[PDB]
Write a protein that binds this ligand. Structure first.
Ligand SMILES: *[C@@H]1O[C@H](CO)[C@@H](O)[C@H](O)[C@H]1NC(C)=O
Lengths: 34, 49, 51, 49
């Protein structure tokens, strides 16, 4: 009798510029500079 | 929300899952899932455990 | 004494100050990475337009 | 982290100090410091208080 929660992930993503730490692995990334 | 929905019926150890003191079957999984769970039926079941 | 973060300690049987270095050092690495990100100066080269 | 390390054994009064019902010695202090503490050994001692 137990219940569990959470979220997901992917095997590969893209490191993204961030305010805090440069190069954070994210679950999906788009492009802003064509 | 799941903390206040379980209330005293499930004191959580905090390793990513909640420990239900009383019995909670597949229907009770579904009732917590669609946030219609009421612990008034199982409060006295889970209090003494 | 733990840095720009800290977990000071006070007891009743074992009175003294400790330091939770595990999250503190990660926090200092985050702040210093932010510092090295922003204090990183650009590569643009201005010229002398006006006299 | 301190909340689900100490569980119901240590209650909160409103200062940040934790009212542990077990007599937390120096080894207990180090164990709750370095993420080693387990509720199962001491919930029997901390239940009745
Ligand atoms: C990830 O983002 C790209 C670009 O927007 C999109 O084409 C793709 O479907 C997305 N994949 C997932 C799993 O979200």
């Amino acid at each position: 009798d137990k219940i569990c929660l959470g979220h997901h992930a992917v095997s590969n993503g893209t490191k993204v510029n961030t305010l805090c730490e440069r190069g954070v692995e994210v679950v999906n990334a788009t492009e802003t500079v064509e | 929300r799941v903390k206040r929905q379980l209330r005293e019926n499930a004191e959580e150890d905090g390793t990513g899952c909640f420990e239900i003191f009383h019995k909670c079957d597949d229907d009770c999984m579904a009732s917590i899932r669609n946030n219609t769970y009421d612990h008034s039926k199982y409060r006295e079941e889970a209090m003494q455990n | 004494i733990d840095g720009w973060y800290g977990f000071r300690h006070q007891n009743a049987q074992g009175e003294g100050t400790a330091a939770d270095y595990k999250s503190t050092q990660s926090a200092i690495d985050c702040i210093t990475g932010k510092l090295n990100r922003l204090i990183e100066k650009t590569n643009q080269q201005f010229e002398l337009i006006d006299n």
